[PDB]
């Protein structure tokens, strides 16, 4: 991705990312936007067209009005973790909400990157009309959905395999190469999706 294209994506994200009120880690918030800027501009422009907001948060997700109804609720796939949405650092789908500083694997989650996994859910649901539950992807998911680990989450929910695979594809060259070797059909699928 040329510098001008990365800049173009950062400009597009400037219209999508919402920063919190009050004090927060501005450098880390910018670092999260920079990682999101590696997503194909086709998806980012569609997010902007749909007025999808990527909300960066200073506190828990359930402190936000729109997610208060999730207080005490155990998310899909989080059975046995002993936590509820109150403790979850990222949310994706019809909206996107992310806790600043929790990007890396092991910060209350086990994704390769918090913001790319969550935003992949929004792209899947809003931009691509739930392609992760299409018959085509379900066939790919049936074969390769257990090759990225966390088989009791990624290997069970096609939308989660899609989101994590999407994050692998776009985080950096290392993860992009790891996905190609582990899930070649998924890699080719995402490669064709961006054309």
């Amino acid at each position: 991705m040329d510098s001008t294209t990365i800049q173009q994506n950062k400009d597009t994200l400037s219209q999508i990312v919402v920063f919190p009120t009050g004090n927060y880690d501005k450098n880390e918030a910018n670092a999260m936007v920079n990682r999101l800027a590696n997503i194909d501009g086709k998806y980012l422009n569609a997010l902007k067209q749909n007025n999808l907001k990527i909300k960066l948060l200073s506190g828990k997700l359930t402190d936000e009005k729109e997610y208060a109804y999730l207080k005490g609720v155990v998310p899909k796939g989080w059975e046995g973790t002993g936590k509820t949405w109150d403790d979850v650092p990222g949310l994706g789908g019809s909206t996107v909400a992310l806790r600043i500083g929790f990007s890396n694997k092991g910060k209350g989650h086990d994704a390769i990157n918090l913001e790319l996994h969550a935003t992949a859910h929004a792209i899947d649901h809003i931009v691509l009309n739930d392609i992760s539950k299409s018959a085509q992807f379900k066939q790919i998911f049936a074969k390769e959905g257990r090759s990225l680990g966390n088989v009791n989450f990624l290997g069970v929910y096609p939308e989660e395999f899609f989101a994590e695979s999407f994050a692998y594809y776009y985080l950096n060259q290392d993860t992009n190469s790891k996905l190609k070797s582990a899930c070649p059909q998924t890699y080719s699928f995402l490669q064709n999706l961006a054309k």
Partner: peptide, 7 residues
């Protein structure tokens, strides 16, 4: 639609 981060 809501989906959580990977546990």
């Amino acid at each position: 639609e809501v989906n959580p981060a990977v546990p």
